[PDB]
Amino acid sequence: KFVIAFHASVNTDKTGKNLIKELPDLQKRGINTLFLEIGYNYQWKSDPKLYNKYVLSETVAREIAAECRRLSIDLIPEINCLGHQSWENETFALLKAYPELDETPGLYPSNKDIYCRSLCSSNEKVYTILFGLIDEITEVFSVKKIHVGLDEVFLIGEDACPLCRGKDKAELFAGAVNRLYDHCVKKRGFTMYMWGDRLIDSEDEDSGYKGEYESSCNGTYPAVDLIPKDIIICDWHYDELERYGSIPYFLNKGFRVLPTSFKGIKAVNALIDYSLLYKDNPAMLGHMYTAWDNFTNKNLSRYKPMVKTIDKLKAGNLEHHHHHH
Ligand SMILES: [Zn+2]
Structure with a gap:
């Protein structure tokens, strides 16, 4: 038996119903788990500063959860809790509402010359806010699982931060992981997931x-030995390679790993094939598909690289059932 997951994103009442459309079909392909990225795109009751009426409402949200449940789809919301606080020249809700919590105050106007902004990992207000958002979203979905993002954190321990300047990037990162872990796992008893790229030495x-x-080029990878190992690592690599050498890296370190693909058809193939080289390790959980080129959630069950490959693995969950007549 194997984990078969799909990563979708939702930010509006519409895009939610689009996803609802595809849940029945995606189930029949073989998906049994849905990673659902929300970010700050939910009408938050817990912080008025980060609320706008033009995103996902409580009603639409309880329907995806309703539908996943009927279809026995393990649902896991995602809020990116460190990096990815912006995209191109749009800075996202948290940092425009709390500019003091920017890791690089006063530096990159319109986000010229950087990938994405990040939150200050040393500022306690961040965790006060994020913990509040994680609690709300896990409630509206009635789930005990959370994906915290933590991918592609390039800005961390930056000189501009009065708080983090000069500090060790790996320890700052491990500090973020461990604060989030203390809330999601220690206090709430959830299962916590994260992206794995910052834990790898490029x-x-x-x-x-x-x-x-x-993989990390800014020296964050040492955090892999400083965080609890019941965290599930989502290990994403989207290029065709003859060896994905971070699967056994994470496995031998004690983590459960969820290899993750995007586009390539073969690239997807090759990940799956290499991940299946360890099929009989239970900490090799399964696979997650992504369709980052799909921005609507329409025809998600038609995502080509998934529909081909999914039976690939579906077989381990077939379950011979025997004639009832
Ligand atoms: Zn900082």
């Missing part, structure tokens, strides 16, 4: 990857 030859996005 320069390492067995576990490293080419770029500076799929």
